Symmetry: C2
């Protein structure tokens, strides 16, 4: 169950990670490892290596081409602040049309993304409106919680460390919907601060850029 | 209200005059609910409906707020719209302005799949109506297992759909309730859609063929 996740690592399947690092990462105490791009073979190869360990393993499906059976959870982004229906339901429709019959709905959890960094690749691809004040962001969180009833609302700051006060304000609006935070977490203090408000804190880039610090984020959140 | 129990509902257009006689027969018909689809005029119609014992719902299509006094507020989300404003845009605007004083316990989302291109709703929302049964089933799954909406709404407004298609959609849904609306003018048409749809919606027929529209209730109930 995702509700228990407090710290998760996110691995880029196009980025290499040696076996000794993968071991240290998977046995670090993190609650889950998310594979997030991407080819189907590389996704399967990485999964097989993770399965050496007992850590829950999830796939974040950003493109149907890399959709792979065998994961514990399928995290499905909905870009709530996108200007294009494509990134809100369109691509989802295409994927569900083709693969819906083989999907186990118990393993699928939608993530109501609110992409907040304009300089990020995700923002540009999805045509996200990042010019948002806290009230805008709060409105999205409330939509996720009450109207769409998504399992997850996800504040995505990508390569920048977000505003902890915004994360705190969003949390107040949420309840049944879980609050995920991602963005520029490199130090344990950064991890700890966001973890005070976010249900679940996601650590990605630091894995490749500052591995030892990335490992330290676990205890900072979980202790 | 426990909307899962609804089998038959009447939908009234507040811009179309309805006399007290027909309103009363409708409200006392045994229908599970009367859905209302100027603010002082909506309130007037509400008050007239309140003289009886039938649940009254407001389907909200404009940013906002919600006119107070209804038992249930129904919020359409047009899943097959090609524009984000009909899926999240206007909903975001509304929640931003009025979200601090909204009672979500009285609000139910309707995952709409608009299936008649000739209607105003389809044209306004830029709905993709050219959908095969697989397309519609895909929307039904999105409504229940990605989005988690209590209602998936097949809207053929004016035209009578294929009951076989409605059967397939129902077979794809689990906990999400299937509403059907479209061209129901006879009790036979109502009963046949009612064996697959959880809830059938009778609208137009109220105005041009009242006796037959009234007869749709018993057809569904029996």
């Amino acid at each position: 169950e995702i509700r228990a996740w407090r710290h998760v690592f996110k691995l880029d399947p196009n980025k290499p990670i040696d076996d000794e690092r993968l071991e240290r990462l998977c046995e670090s105490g993190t609650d889950a490892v998310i594979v997030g791009g991407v080819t189907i073979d590389n996704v399967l190869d990485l999964l097989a290596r993770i399965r050496r360990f007992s850590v829950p393993c999830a796939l974040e499906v950003t493109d149907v081409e890399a959709l792979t059976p065998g994961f514990d959870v399928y995290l499905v982004p909905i870009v709530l602040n996108s200007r294009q229906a494509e990134w809100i339901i369109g691509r989802h429709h295409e994927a569900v049309k083709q693969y819906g019959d083989m999907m186990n709905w118990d393993e699928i959890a939608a993530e109501g993304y609110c992409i907040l960094n304009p300089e990020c690749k995700a923002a540009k691809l999805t045509r996200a409106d990042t010019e948002l004040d806290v009230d805008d962001i709060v409105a999205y969180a409330r939509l996720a919680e009450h109207l769409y009833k998504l399992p997850i609302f996800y504040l995505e700051y990508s390569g920048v460390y977000g505003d902890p006060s915004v994360v705190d304000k969003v949390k107040q609006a949420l309840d049944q919907t879980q609050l995920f935070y991602g963005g520029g977490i490199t130090t344990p203090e950064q991890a700890e601060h966001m973890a005070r408000y976010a249900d679940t804190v996601v650590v990605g880039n630091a894995i490749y850029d500052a591995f030892e610090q990335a490992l330290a984020t676990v205890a900072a959140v979980k202790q």
